[PDB]
Each structure stands twice: as C-alpha cells, then as structure tokens.
Design a protein around this ligand. Structure first.
Ligand SMILES: *[C@@H]1O[C@H](CO)[C@@H](O[C@@H]2O[C@H](CO)[C@@H](O[C@@H]3O[C@H](CO[C@H]4O[C@H](CO)[C@@H](O)[C@H](O[C@H]5O[C@H](CO)[C@@H](O)[C@H](O)[C@@H]5O)[C@@H]4O)[C@@H](O)[C@H](O[C@H]4O[C@H](CO)[C@@H](O)[C@H](O)[C@@H]4O[C@H]4O[C@H](CO)[C@@H](O)[C@H](O)[C@@H]4O)[C@@H]3O)[C@H](O)[C@H]2NC(C)=O)[C@H](O)[C@H]1NC(C)=O
Ligand SMILES: *[C@@H]1O[C@H](CO)[C@@H](O[C@@H]2O[C@H](CO)[C@@H](O[C@@H]3O[C@H](CO[C@H]4O[C@H](CO)[C@@H](O)[C@H](O)[C@@H]4O)[C@@H](O)[C@H](O[C@H]4O[C@H](CO)[C@@H](O)[C@H](O)[C@@H]4O[C@H]4O[C@H](CO)[C@@H](O)[C@H](O)[C@@H]4O)[C@@H]3O)[C@H](O)[C@H]2NC(C)=O)[C@H](O)[C@H]1NC(C)=O
Ligand SMILES: *[C@@H]1O[C@H](CO)[C@@H](O[C@@H]2O[C@H](CO)[C@@H](O[C@@H]3O[C@H](CO[C@H]4O[C@H](CO)[C@@H](O)[C@H](O[C@H]5O[C@H](CO)[C@@H](O)[C@H](O)[C@@H]5O)[C@@H]4O)[C@@H](O)[C@H](O[C@H]4O[C@H](CO)[C@@H](O)[C@H](O)[C@@H]4O)[C@@H]3O)[C@H](O)[C@H]2NC(C)=O)[C@H](O)[C@H]1NC(C)=O
Ligand SMILES: *[C@@H]1O[C@H](CO)[C@@H](O[C@@H]2O[C@H](CO)[C@@H](O[C@@H]3O[C@H](CO)[C@@H](O)[C@H](O)[C@@H]3O)[C@H](O)[C@H]2NC(C)=O)[C@H](O)[C@H]1NC(C)=O
Ligand SMILES: [Cu+2]
Lengths: 678, 680
C-alpha cells in the first residue's frame, strides 16, 4: 500500500491570441494511430496539394526534394518507424523540413493534415512533435507528455494486454472479480495497477533499480533532449546562438545522466558501471517485455558475442572510429574535416562532442557527402542483438532504436560511459583551474545545514488511451479512459541554509551539487576521482551585504528541476479558463523534482553536498535570446568541467562539503500492489 | 575510533589431579618454532628411544610402522607442512598414532619431547594438538586458541612485517614516531593495529565482507571441526556411540557454514553464491597477502583455466566422481564399497556424507587399498592454482590457502565448491518423504507471541597474542619473551532476549528450537520456505516444562546452545591456572561458533531477518548415548525439522510454530578501517 499522489498544478495565464492554435494542435494529436473520415482535417488532407502551394514555403529546394522523395513512394501505414532506419529517417527529415519552412500557421496546419491523412502515423507524430517544439509561431504552446503520446513504449506487456482485453470486451464481463487482477472500474474510467520489471527481464540484480531506469519521466527526459537537439539538424536551426557550445551540452547532459545512474547503483549496492571489449562478449542480459504492433522487442542473453559473421564491417568501423580519436590525442593540434583543432584550448570541446555524435555540424565545412556513417548508430545496432537482414521492409525493434526506450537498456549506459571515458582522456589536456580563479577573496562559507532527506513511493496515474484502437461510435461521441496507476519515487520538501561571512558587499553566484561519498568497495572517493560523479542540483545568484548572511533555498526553487506534467483532461479544463500548466511551458526540458534524491534506506544511505560561491558575471549580449537556461558566462558544470588534479589547491574557504543521509519511509520495495496489500 | 573489548570469563575449578598435565602441555607449546637446549624436554627427547620402550605402547604395529618410516627419513626442519602433502600426511599420521596409543601420560610426554627435538615443528605441533584433543587422560585441560599457535595464518603481511621489524630492532629507534604507523609501546608490550584485506585481495566487491571471512574465530572454528573429526581417522576412535551419524555431522556443519556466509552476502548486497563449471574459465580471482617462512601464498589470476593438460587427469577423476553419484541417484538401492545402501531411508545420509568426504569409514568393508584418492583434495589442488611443478616435486611446495584448515575459509572458491557438494546432497535429499502433519502438529500447544529486544551490531577492538610468529634470542628464551599483541576490529552484537508465550492445555516436557534465516534474496523478492529451508541457521535448542495454562519463556542470547564465548589469552590462562581454575567453554564448548558472530552487520545500516520458533514433544536419547549427553538434547536428527526438503509449506502453519520478522541495526562506524592515529 502506497499513498495516492494529489497536487494542484501551478498554472499561468495563456495569451488569448495563441488559444486557437493550442486547440488545433491538440486536435491533431487525438487518436493519431487512426484516421477518422468524419474529422475536419480529413477533407483538408485529402484535398491539399503541396506543389500548387509551393509559393507558401519560404525555401523552394525543400519542396522540390520532398516532392522528389514522394514520387518514389513513402513507407506504408501500420508499420514500425525508427529514426535509425535510413530510408525512414530520410523521409521524415524532408517532412520535418517542410513543416519547419511553412510560411504561416495555416500552411503548417494544412501540411500536417495532409501528412496525417496520407503518411505513416509514426513519422507524422514524430515530425509534428518536433516542429511544434521548434516552430517560432507555436512557441508558448503546451504539448502532451511523451508517455501519453506513446503509451506502449512506457509500459510492460501485461498491463497493455489487460487494457486490450478490456477494450475488446468493451468493459468487464464479471466485474466483481476484476479487482483481484488489478483492474478497477470507477468514475467512468478503468484503472490498471502496474508492476516494474523483475529479475526475469534484468540479470545480475539490476532489477533492484527497475523503478528508476523504467520511470516514465526518466525516459521522457531523454526523449525531450533528443527532440530539442537532434543529431540530424544544424545548430543554427536547433539552438541558435549556442551553436559553438553544442558539444559542451552533449557532454554535460550525458555525464549528468551517467552520474545519476551511478548514484542509483550505489544506493542499490550494484557497484560501478562495467566496461566491455568489442572483440569480447557483452555481459548484460536483457529480455524486454515490450511490443509495438505486437512485434516483440529484441532479446539479448547474458553472454552475447558482439563480433559475429554479419557484423564484421560495423565492428571494423567502430574500432577505427576509436583509434583515430586516440591518434588525435597524440597530435594535439591538427586539421580534421576542414576545421583546425587545437586540443590545448578548452573551446575544442565543441569539436570533440560533435565528433562523438557524428552530427551535421561535424561536416559543415566539407562538400555534401553521399557516404554517411555514425559511430552511435553502429554501436546501437551491434548492441541491440537484433537479427541482421538486408531487406528494408523487415525489422525487429530494439530498445536502442527508440529514444523513448533507450534508457531501459544497460548497454546504453556502458556505451556512453566508454564514450565519456574517451572524452575525459581528451579533457586531461586542459590546464587545471588555479587558486586565483577559485578563491573568493573576502567571502567565507561559515556553515551549511540541510533538513531531513526522505524518499518514498507514491501512486501516480497517467492516461494510456492512445495505445488502443477505438470503434466508430467511440470516435464519434467519446472514448473511455484507460488509466495506468503505478508506484513512483518521490521526496519530501527540504531546505538548504547557507551561513556566509563577507565584509565586502557584492553580487555572487551559488552552485549546489550532490554526489557520492563511498564507492562500491566501501572506501571514500577522493575528489580527484569523484569530480565526474557530482550532479549539479542548484545554480542561482544572490547579493551579499557587509557582515553575516543567511541564505535559505527551498527544494521547490532549484534551477535544474521542474514539476510533474498533467493529463490532457486538466489541460482542457485550464484552457477553458484561459490558463496552461506553467511548468509544461516553463522548464519542460528538465528532470522532474521527484527524482532529485536517490531512494534511501531505513537506516540511511550516505551522500554529500558541495556548495560553491564565486563572483557573478552577466551572460554575454548575443546570448540574450537564451537567457532562461543560463545564469552567467561560466561553462556548464563549472568548476567540475575539467579534471581536478590536486584536491589541496582546489579547496578554498568559499567551498563547503557536507555529509548527509537519505532515509526511506514506508515500503522499501515497489511491488506491493496486490488487492490483498491495499 | 572503536571501543575496547572488556568481558568476564566463565571459570570452573580444575581437577587437582590434572594440575600437572596442563602445565606440561603448556610447556611444550612455548616457542614451538624453536628448540631451546636449556629446557628439560631437550634432554628427555635427545635421550629417549622409541624402540626400547615398545612395551609402553598398546599397539605394536604402530611402533613398527613409525620406526620404518623414520628409518626412511622424515621431512627436514624449517619447511612448510600441510596435511594435503601425501608423504607429510603419512608421516604425521604415523606420529599421531604413536602419540595416541601411549599407555600413560609419561610415555606420551617423552614421545612428544622426542618429536619436538627431532621432527619438523609443524608436524609436531599438529600431532600434539590433535592428541591432546583426543587423548583420554588429557580431557579437561585447556589449549591455546589456534590464532595464538599459528599467528602467521591469521594476519596479513603488513602487520607481520611491522612485528618482524620491531623484533629485529629490539624496540623503536624513534619511539615518538611509532603511533603514526600503528605501533603503540605500552606496559612492556607492543600493540600493532591490524586492518582487514582490501580490494587488492578480493574482487567483485567481496572485500566488504572480509571482516567476516578473515575473522579469527571463523577459521578457528573450522580448524576445531577438522581436529575433532579428521577425515583420515576411523569413526570409532572419533565418535564411539554415535559413529553411524558421522555423515550427518558432515552435512550439518557445512550446511551451516555456507548458510551464515550466504546471510552475510545478503547483508552486503552481494547476492547468491556463484556456480561454476570445471571445464570453463574460473571467474573468481584471489590475491592473498599471506606468507609462511617468507614463501608467498599462491595467487589465482582472474579467468584461470582449470582444464589444462597438466591437470587433465585430476579433472577427469573429479568429473567421474560426480557422474557416479548421479548414477546412484538413478539406482536408488544398490551396493557400493561392499555396503548395501537404500536412498529411500534417511539413515543413508551417513553413507552420502562419507562418500563426499572420502573418509576412512567409506572403505571400512573393503581390503586395505594402496590406491586412494579424495574428491575434496583433488578439487582443492585444482582450485589452488599452484604451479604443477610444486605438486610434482616433493621437496618443494608453494602454499595455498586451501592447503590449510586455518586459512581455507579465506578463499571464496571454498564456498562455491562446498555449495556444489551440498547441491548434490540436496538432490539426494529430494528422495526423502516430507514430514506429515501428525509429526509436526503438537496437539494442545499454541504459541501466542514471540518478542525480541533490539538487535544491534558493532565493531570493537580485540587484542590477541602473536609472540609465536617471531624467532627469539637466547637471552629472551632464558629470561622472558617479548609481548607482541595484535589489536584488530571485530564484529559483535549486544545482548538480547527472546520471550515466548505458550498456552498449554496439559502439563508436559517440551523441546523448543529457535532458528534464524533471511527474508529477501539478492533480487529483492521474498523467499518461500520450499527454497528457504536450507538457509535457516539453528540458534537455540533446549528443553522446558509447561504447566497447564499460560507460560512465558525468557531465553537470553548468552545462553544459546550452539554458541560459545571468546577464548582467553595465554597470560589469562596462566593467571587462572595459578588460582586453580580453567575456562569452561575452552574446555568443552570450543567446537561451537563464537557468540559475537550470531547477527549480520548490514551495509545499509538496517537488515531484515526472520526467526522461527518450534515446540515439540520431548523424548530422552537412547541410553547408549550416555557419554554424549552434553551435546545431544533429544533423539531428533540435527537440523530438525529443517533436515529434509519442504514440499507443502502449509504443513508448517501449525499452532506450535511461529515466524517472526526482525530487523538488525548497526551502531557506530559502519566500516572497520577507521583505526588510524588521527581517527583515534
Ligand atoms: C506476404 O509477403 C509478401 C512478400 O513481401 C507480401 O507481398 C508484398 O505486399 C506488399 C504490400 O501489399 C507489396 O507492396 C506493394 O506493391 C504494389 C505493387 O507495385 C508494383 O507496381 C508498381 C508500379 O505500379 C512498382 O513500383 C512496384 O515495384 C517497383 O517499384 C518499387 C518502388 O519502390 C521498387 O522498389 C521495385 O523494385 C519496383 O521497381 C511493383 O512492381 C505497390 O503498388 C504498392 O505501393 C503503394 O504502397 C506503397 C507503400 O509504401 C507506396 O510507397 C506506393 O507509392 C504505393 O502507394 C499506395 O500506398 C497506399 C496503399 O498502401 C495508398 O495510399 C494507395 O493505395 C497508394 O496507391 C506496395 O508497394 C509488395 O510488392 C508485395 N511483394 C511481392 C508480391 O513480392 C504480402 O503482402 C504478404 N502478405 C501478408 C498478408 O502479409
Ligand atoms: C640447492 O638445491 C639442491 C637440490 O635441491 C639442494 O641439495 C639437496 O640438499 C639436501 C639437504 O638440504 C640433500 O638432502 C640430504 O641428503 C643427504 C645425503 O643423502 C645421500 O646420501 C645418503 C647416504 O649417505 C643416501 O641415503 C641418500 O639417498 C642420498 O644419496 C642425507 O644424508 C640427508 O638426510 C638427512 O636429512 C634428512 C632430512 O633432510 C633425513 O630424512 C635423513 O634421515 C637424514 O637425517 C639426518 O639429520 C637428522 C636431523 O639432524 C638426524 O636426526 C639424522 O640422524 C641424520 O643425521 C638429506 O636427505 C639432498 O640430497 C640434496 N640434493 C642434491 C641433488 O644435491 C641444496 O641443499 C640446495 N641449497 C640450498 C642452499 O638451499
Ligand atoms: C604472549 O605469549 C608469550 C609466549 O607464550 C607469553 O610469555 C609467556 O609468559 C608466561 C607467563 O609469564 C611464562 O610462563 C611463566 O614463566 C615464568 C618464568 O619461567 C622462567 O623462569 C623461571 C625462574 O624464574 C625458571 O624456573 C623457568 O624454568 C623452569 O621451567 C621450564 C619449563 O617452562 C623448565 O624447563 C626449567 O627446567 C625450569 O623448571 C623459566 O626459565 C615461570 O616462573 C612461571 O611459572 C609459574 O607458573 C607455573 C604455571 O602456573 C607454575 O607451575 C610455576 O610453579 C610458577 O608458579 C610461568 O611458567 C612463559 O614462560 C612465557 N613464554 C615465553 C616463551 O617466554 C606472554 O606472557 C604473552 N603475553 C600476553 C598474553 O600478553
Ligand atoms: C484520456 O485521453 C483521452 C484521449 O486523449 C481523453 O478523451 C478526450 O477528452 C477530451 C476532453 O473531454 C475531448 O476533447 C473535448 O471533446 C468535446 C467533445 O466531446 C469538446 O466539446 C471539447 O471542447 C473538447 O475538445 C477529446 O475529444 C477526447 N478524445 C477522445 C478520443 O475521445 C480522456 O478524457 C482522457 N482521460 C483522462 C482521465 O485524462
Ligand atoms: Cu572475475
């Protein structure tokens, strides 16, 4: 038994002008798996002609390319779509460009209706989601959470089977027994209790942390990161002025993800992330209970040999792609891809990041190439263990083929740990920070206190109606509400109080990180090795007056976390009053606040907080359009963006380390969801 | 920083007729690594001749065989001795047989002096310890703990290096700097702070539980078990009245040793004991920091291949042995080694045990065989990873942790090997018919409630004497030896009481058993009894009288049947002897696990466990088991009722049975390595 999560949403008034657009957008996301002839968009899609409206798109080459591709024929409907399939990616890129270069919202809406009427549902939904995220005229509009757009990618096969059975039966035949199978009928809705994957899916005791790696928002964060910065889009059209910091963002995001995963492993007593050899076999078994269009996901055994007859070529490429990088480390200063690279300079980070993502920016200076390869794509194909075939119309889906399910596979963490190890080998070049840059003359942190740190499991409900196929009557009048109620990790509110002394009155920036204290072997971790495992949790500014100062920062005001998203019904309810969930418009790309702390234990799990105070400097001018994600001009992860070589010279009076303990209240495990346990 | 261990010793008056033997024994164990010409035993041994006193030994063939082997020549002094070395095993067995059959204590003392003067020190000490444990006229005296007789087998190389440096320097050149390196000079003695092995020795995060597997009490318990029931000795001499239960004992002890170990793995989040295949690379490595006579112990590299050509023969034998047992399981009833065996009968356990130990009792009905091979010895040799040249050549051996019973429990492979053996034995056990309700249900007795006080564990400093590890000078031998004391953290638990409420319709004598076991497995799921019956550890076993109505039973952990107190140091033994008293537990309770190791620690600072309480009717043991009353409480098999597989758990939901969920907490430092100068 767990408490039910109820919390009012902090909403904000929406501009009336955008109201209509909001409506239309939602209308295009309803039952996207099916085409309803009676809907308004159907006639527009069946009658719209892009060529006749070629003047309505700013760029003409995009229209010509899209028409040329469409003449050849796009993929059929009711087929699995993945961005890692070359032909499908080629088609969806053209569709997205056509969406992006539409003159106005009317043309974009017409094109979206046409795409939904004629094109594959998966490609349409992907392109429409990305375009709505990126289109300027749609900026400020609320989108449904990814787990409500692709429910089948965020729930296991048993719950979906129960939902499909209910849909086929159009209710319960013997309702008084459904309770014993985790199916509750109430308030014109059906609630399905769900468990997380167990040892059958995960080996080597990994299932102990299934509540974290299978969390809906944990994967939605990665999907949002992919959508905001997609590898196949140029920096100008995706990020704007932060184009030279793309590699920094890549490294920072992946390092933070791996650090949080390592913290969870330590909390569950699983140790460090294993390393593997390509010419040897992977030692991470995975048996996902996931399906799309009833097609099972690929399964990998415990001892899988990565180098087989049908993979040699890919293997070779991977190996080469690594060795070349090592050669660069020996050269230091070189010329690659028509770009001069100097590894002694920190800015080179950008190049490095792009090199390890094989994004378009890496090839912006060389002529348009028809020979395309990607290290990450080949690594994902090798690790997925799916059968290899030369036929383009037959694929076995894998968790690594979708950004919605990538984080469910440990191989993802191992691969990106290898990549970040290479990047840190590169980072070894950089000169360590000096005292003059670190010491804050006339500023000393006297004390730091933190309230009790508590974690627990609470029931959370999310709408999963899009996974089923509706009948004509349901489409015409109304469909039932299939709601998944599952346990999720959460933490109670806590406050951090910092007592500082400074006789000089000045502006300053305060950063707060959380990190581990002991490794898997039970020994303390020196800062010279723990600098890569620290997770930034807070980053803000404050004005210090002469004398004593006491700063109280609440967990609800941390910069790098948001609140939970809400269901579509509440979105419509608020829209009827001219309001939108503020956190679904503001800070909708950040991690949820419920995942801030790792799950604790009854006795308590030890961790530490790092508090850093340094001088403030305003962000640059041309950085003005993006002054909602940054607070100063320092690199992301400062001061831990480069290796710490001597802890003695790093510590300063304006830095503080504190040891804390995280406790658990209520049930320690999340599987107590039976009728007899409620 | 940790507190210091202070405890009172349970003492009993020593028989005045045994005041002479005790001293004598304690005189022959002083600096046993060296021979002092000024001692009486030196002259006695130098002048004593075995053959001239052939009439002083009950058996004559023993003397003849010993004389023949001695003429052939024994191993030279100053060499590593192990019972697994065949020639050394034969020589030491002959010497022990000569010791045991001595008609009187005087002849035994003369023979011991002769052996110390003329024979290898290791063989002498081993045989003398065994004989003192087994001789009839030595029953009642106290022997020093194994870790004080073989300090080098219970400490790491760093502390031994420090002790050797201090001995060579005859003190500290600069005393003020001693504390910064963990050496304290106080009260005419030198205290050395000792750590446990770290990740260099153990992989896969197993070092977390080093404190448990390197504990002196754990290895001393294993060595005591070996000494009391040697595999090469006949059961009749070892156990007279209950010889037929020998195999059962073999099953009961190991099943316990693994279970506790498994529990510790659950406390540190390490999971289940791995299983391995002989014909595949071994994945568990081991780098012991142990040395004997400055010879390093063998190191097993990770991914070591066990089926190389050099070992192939051994491998085959191993495999064959296993195969044979499986074939027996298909036969059910058969005749092996001229013994009729029926596996449908629980008694057959005896044979099974013997079969997996390759002990003497297995070959008692067949003519004396010059050909003999042991499954356990071959497996130990294969897993030791010592160079094959060491095995082939007789005058040279590289020691391994599996070659000594004082260090076997340090190696992880021991647990896996014996887990495989116990898996075979449980596959055999599947034959037995499960206990019925009629035998499990005690009509008229219902347990109302079971309460337990707070269960707390903590580390505390423990001091033990390691003077025997060094070689002393002539002046030290003459006047007095130096005192080198090793101070190390050790696990311990605070006292707690179990209170049981019982409602009885009638008055009668009953037997109460208390077991401990785990609740969740490595994957975090509850363990059903069908799989958890093997994981329960028997804590208490005692009789009681129930009167009609309500009754309350308060049982203190300091009274549990299956646990003992910590052994006392040699100086305290002398102090008590001067006052005519001896430690009772070291006298007759040394074959039981220390009480300090009852509860696990837990790395999360809180660990869930379960206690099982069962009450059943009392029946006195058969009369012939009269001289074993102190160790048998009733006629039930050891481990009852968890001695056979549980098939239908709802048979154990009886009124006279109770399952309780409990939690164990940790007080103070979670880790034992905070023992530096600046942390103290
Ligand atoms: C059991 O297995 C077998 C073996 O796979 C299956 O048989 C396959 O079934 C599929 C689908 O039913 C067939 O694909 C369809 O083929 C149609 C016939 O096309 C032929 O003529 C056209 C010219 O008119 C040629 O272009 C075709 O091939 C040539 O061109 C392609 C172009 O890519 C080249 O690749 C070839 O090498 C040739 O050069 C054939 O000769 C075809 O009309 C149809 O195409 C429509 O649908 C696709 C969907 O992607 C569109 O791309 C395309 O533009 C067409 O557009 C239609 O799309 C939808 C309908 O799907 C609607 O909007 C409109 O109706 C619109 O017209 C499609 O490609 C395949 O050929 C066939 N293989 C065989 C027989 O070997 C069985 O289906 C399967 N059974 C079950 C129960 O599972
Ligand atoms: C470098 O490496 C080499 C090769 O490994 C090594 O050489 C070997 O040294 C050992 C000594 O450590 C030698 O062993 C001794 O050999 C002598 C001679 O034996 C030969 O001759 C006799 C007849 O006289 C034959 O029977 C025999 O088969 C040989 O042909 C023996 O006399 C020694 O026996 C005594 O010691 C044994 C224990 O080691 C006893 O078992 C035996 O009964 C003898 O006991 C004596 O001492 C007792 C204790 O004081 C005493 O009680 C007895 O009464 C008696 O006096 C011994 O076996 C070996 O043969 C050498 N091998 C070779 C090939 O040379 C080097 O020593 C080594 N160097 C270093 C520095 O390590
Ligand atoms: C750590 O471990 C070391 C080694 O085990 C400990 O050192 C030992 O301490 C004990 C206790 O102090 C010693 O035993 C005592 O020894 C004294 C001294 O004996 C010497 O001096 C005598 C004259 O003063 C001399 O007569 C002795 O020689 C006789 O005995 C030998 C045999 O031992 C015999 O061969 C000779 O012919 C003599 O007959 C010897 O040179 C001794 O006086 C004590 O005897 C008393 O107690 C016994 C037993 O109750 C009793 O029978 C006696 O009548 C007398 O009342 C006692 O034996 C031991 O010798 C030390 N060992 C070594 C190697 O030096 C150390 O204490 C430990 N430290 C800790 C635990 O902190
Ligand atoms: C779970 O999801 C389904 C599908 O997204 C939700 O059904 C949808 O509910 C909204 C709001 O009631 C419907 O929009 C409204 O439709 C009415 C006409 O019926 C219109 O007058 C309103 O202005 C508004 O547009 C939407 O059509 C409907 N979708 C389908 C396919 O029926 C359901 O409410 C969700 N349940 C929960 C508990 O969140
Ligand atoms: Cu290994």
């Amino acid at each position: 038994g767990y408490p039910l999560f109820n919390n009012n949403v902090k909403t904000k008034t929406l501009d009336p002008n955008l109201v209509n657009i909001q409506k239309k957008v939602l209308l295009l996301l309803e039952n996207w798996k099916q085409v309803d002839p009676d809907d308004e968009y159907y006639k527009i899609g069946k009658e719209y002609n892009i060529e006749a409206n070629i003047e309505s798109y700013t760029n003409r080459e995009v229209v010509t390319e899209f028409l040329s591709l469409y003449k050849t024929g796009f993929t059929a409907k009711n087929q699995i779509f993945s961005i890692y399939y070359e032909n499908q990616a080629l088609e969806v890129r053209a569709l997205y460009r056509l969406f992006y270069y539409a003159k106005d919202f009317e043309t974009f809406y017409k094109t979206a209706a046409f795409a939904r009427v004629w094109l594959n549902e998966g490609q349409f939904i992907y392109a429409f989601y990305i375009a709505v995220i990126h289109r300027a005229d749609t900026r400020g509009i609320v989108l449904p959470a990814p787990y409500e757009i692709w429910p089948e990618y965020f729930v296991n096969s048993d719950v979906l089977a129960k939902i499909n059975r209910i849909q086929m039966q159009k209710g319960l035949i013997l309702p008084e027994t459904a309770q014993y199978y985790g199916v509750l009928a109430k308030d014109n809705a059906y609630y399905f209790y769900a468990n997380y994957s167990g040892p059958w899916t995960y080996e080597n005791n990994e299932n102990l942390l299934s509540y974290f790696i299978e969390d809906v928002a944990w994967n939605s964060y990665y999907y949002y990161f992919h959508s905001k910065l997609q590898f196949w889009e140029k920096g100008e059209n995706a990020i704007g002025p932060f184009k030279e910091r793309r590699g920094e963002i890549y490294y920072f995001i992946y390092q933070q993800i791996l650090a949080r995963y390592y913290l969870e492993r330590l909390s569950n007593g699983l140790g460090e992330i294993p390393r593997f050899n390509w010419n040897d076999r992977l030692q991470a078994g995975y048996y996902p209970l996931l399906t799309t269009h009833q097609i099972p996901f690929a399964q990998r055994n415990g001892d899988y040999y990565l180098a087989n007859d049908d993979n040699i070529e890919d293997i070779q490429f991977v190996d080469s792609y690594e060795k070349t990088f090592l050669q660069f480390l020996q050269k230091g200063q070189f010329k690659a891809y028509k770009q001069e690279v100097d590894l002694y300079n920190s800015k080179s980070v950008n190049f490095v990041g792009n090199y390890w993502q094989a994004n378009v920016d890496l090839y912006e200076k060389v002529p348009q190439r028809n020979y395309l390869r990607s290290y990450e794509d080949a690594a994902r194909r090798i690790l997925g263990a799916a059968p290899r075939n030369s036929y383009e119309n037959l694929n076995v889906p894998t968790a690594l083929d979708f950004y919605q399910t990538s984080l469910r596979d440990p191989a993802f963490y191992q691969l990106y740990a290898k990549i970040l190890d290479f990047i840190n080998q590169y980072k070894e070049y950089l000169e360590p920070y000096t005292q003059d840059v670190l010491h804050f003359v006339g500023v000393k942190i006297n004390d730091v206190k933190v309230d009790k740190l508590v974690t627990y499991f609470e029931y959370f409900d999310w709408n999963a109606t899009n996974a089923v196929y509706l009948s004509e009557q349901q489409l015409d009048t109304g469909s039932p509400s299939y709601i998944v109620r599952q346990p999720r990790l959460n933490n109670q509110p806590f406050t951090v109080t910092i007592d500082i002394k400074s006789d000089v009155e000045s502006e300053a920036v305060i950063k707060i990180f959380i990190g581990p204290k002991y490794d898997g072997n039970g020994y303390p971790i020196d800062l010279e090795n723990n600098w890569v495992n620290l997770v930034e949790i807070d980053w803000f500014t404050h004005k210090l007056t002469s004398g004593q100062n006491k700063i109280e920062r609440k967990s609800e005001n941390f910069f790098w976390f948001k609140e939970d998203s809400v269901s579509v019904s509440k979105i419509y309810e608020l829209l009827n009053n001219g309001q939108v969930p503020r956190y679904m418009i503001e800070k909708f790309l950040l991690l949820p606040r419920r995942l801030l702390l790792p799950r604790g234990t009854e006795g308590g799990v030890p961790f530490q907080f790092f508090v850093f105070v340094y001088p403030y400097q305003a962000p640059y001018k041309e950085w003005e359009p993006m002054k909602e994600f940054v607070v100063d001009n320092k690199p992301f992860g400062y001061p831990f963006d480069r290796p710490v070589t001597e802890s003695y010279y790093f510590t300063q009076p304006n830095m503080y380390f504190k040891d804390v303990y995280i406790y658990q209240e209520g049930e320690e495990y999340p599987y107590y969801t039976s009728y007899w346990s409620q | 920083g940790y507190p210091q261990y202070h405890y009172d010793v349970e003492t009993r008056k020593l028989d005045p007729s045994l005041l002479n033997i005790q001293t004598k024994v304690l005189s022959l164990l002083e600096n046993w690594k060296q021979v002092n010409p000024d001692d009486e035993y030196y002259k006695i041994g130098k002048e004593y001749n075995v053959e001239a006193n052939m009439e002083s030994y009950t058996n004559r063939e023993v003397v003849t065989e010993f004389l023949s082997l001695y003429k052939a020549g024994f191993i030279p002094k100053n060499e590593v001795f192990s019972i697994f070395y065949e020639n050394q095993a034969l020589e030491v067995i002959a010497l022990y047989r000569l010791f045991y059959y001595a008609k009187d204590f005087e002849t035994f003392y003369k023979t011991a002096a002769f052996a110390r003067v003329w024979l290898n020190e290791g063989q002498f000490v081993y045989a003398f310890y065994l004989a003192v444990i087994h001789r009839a006229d030595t029953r009642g005296i106290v022997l020093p703990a194994p870790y004080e007789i073989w300090p080098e087998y219970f400490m790491n190389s760093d502390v031994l290096s420090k002790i050797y440096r201090i001995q060579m320097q005859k003190g500290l050149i600069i005393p003020e700097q001693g504390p910064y390196y963990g050496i304290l000079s106080k009260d005419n003695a030198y205290y050395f702070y000792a750590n446990y092995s770290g990740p260099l020795t153990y992989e896969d995060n197993e070092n977390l539980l080093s404190y448990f597997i390197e504990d002196i009490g754990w290895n001393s318990y294993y060595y005591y078990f070996h000494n009391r029931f040697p595999f090469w000795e006949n059961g009749e001499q070892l156990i007279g009245p209950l010889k037929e239960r020998r195999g059962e004992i073999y099953y009961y002890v190991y099943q316990k040793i693994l279970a506790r170990y498994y529990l510790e793995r659950l406390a540190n989040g390490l999971g289940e004991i791995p299983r391995f295949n002989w014909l595949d690379k071994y994945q568990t490595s081991y780098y012991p920091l142990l040395s004997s006579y400055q010879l390093p112990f063998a190191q097993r590299n990770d991914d070591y291949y066990l089926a190389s050509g050099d070992n192939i023969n051994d491998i085959q034998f191993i495999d064959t042995y296993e195969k044979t047992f499986l074939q027996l399981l298909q036969k059910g009833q058969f005749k092996a080694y001229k013994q009729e065996v029926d596996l449908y009968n629980s008694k057959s356990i005896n044979f099974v045990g013997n079969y997996w130990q390759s002990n003497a009792d297995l070959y008692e009905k067949v003519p004396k065989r010059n050909y003999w091979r042991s499954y356990e010895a071959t497996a130990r040799r294969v897993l030791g990873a010592a160079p094959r040249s060491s095995i082939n050549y007789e005058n040279m051996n590289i020691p391994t942790a599996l070659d000594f019973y004082q260090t076997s429990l340090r190696d992880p492979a021991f647990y896996q090997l014996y887990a495989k053996i116990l898996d075979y034995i449980n596959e055999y056990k599947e034959y037995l018919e499960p206990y019925s309700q009629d035998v499990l249900h005690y009509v008229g007795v219902k347990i109302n409630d079971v309460k337990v006080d707070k269960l707390v564990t903590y580390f505390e400093y423990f001091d033990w004497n390691a003077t025997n590890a060094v070689y002393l000078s002539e002046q030290q031998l003459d006047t007095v030896s130096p005192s080198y004391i090793v101070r190390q953290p050790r696990l311990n638990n605070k006292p707690f009481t179990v209170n049981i409420d019982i409602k009885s319709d009638v008055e009668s004598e009953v037997v109460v058993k208390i077991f401990l076991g785990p609740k969740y497995d490595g994957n975090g799921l509850p363990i059903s009894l069908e799989d958890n019956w093997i994981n329960f550890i028997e804590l208490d076993w005692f009789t009681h009288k129930l009167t009609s109505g309500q009754n309350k039973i308060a049982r203190k952990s300091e009274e549990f049947f299956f646990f003992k107190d910590d052994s006392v140091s040699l100086f305290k033994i002398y102090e008590l002897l001067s006052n005519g008293q001896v430690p009772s537990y070291m006298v007759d309770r040394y074959i039981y696990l220390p009480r300090r190791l009852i509860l696990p620690r837990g790395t999360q600072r809180g660990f869930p466990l379960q206690l099982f309480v069962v009450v059943y009717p009392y029946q006195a043991p058969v009369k012939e088991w009269e001289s074993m009353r102190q160790y048998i409480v009733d006629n039930k098999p050891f481990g009852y009722p968890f001695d056979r597989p549980v098939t239908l758990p709802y048979y154990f939901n009886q009124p006279n049975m109770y399952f309780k969920d409990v939690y164990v907490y940790q007080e103070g430092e979670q880790y034992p390595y905070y023992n530096s100068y600046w942390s103290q």
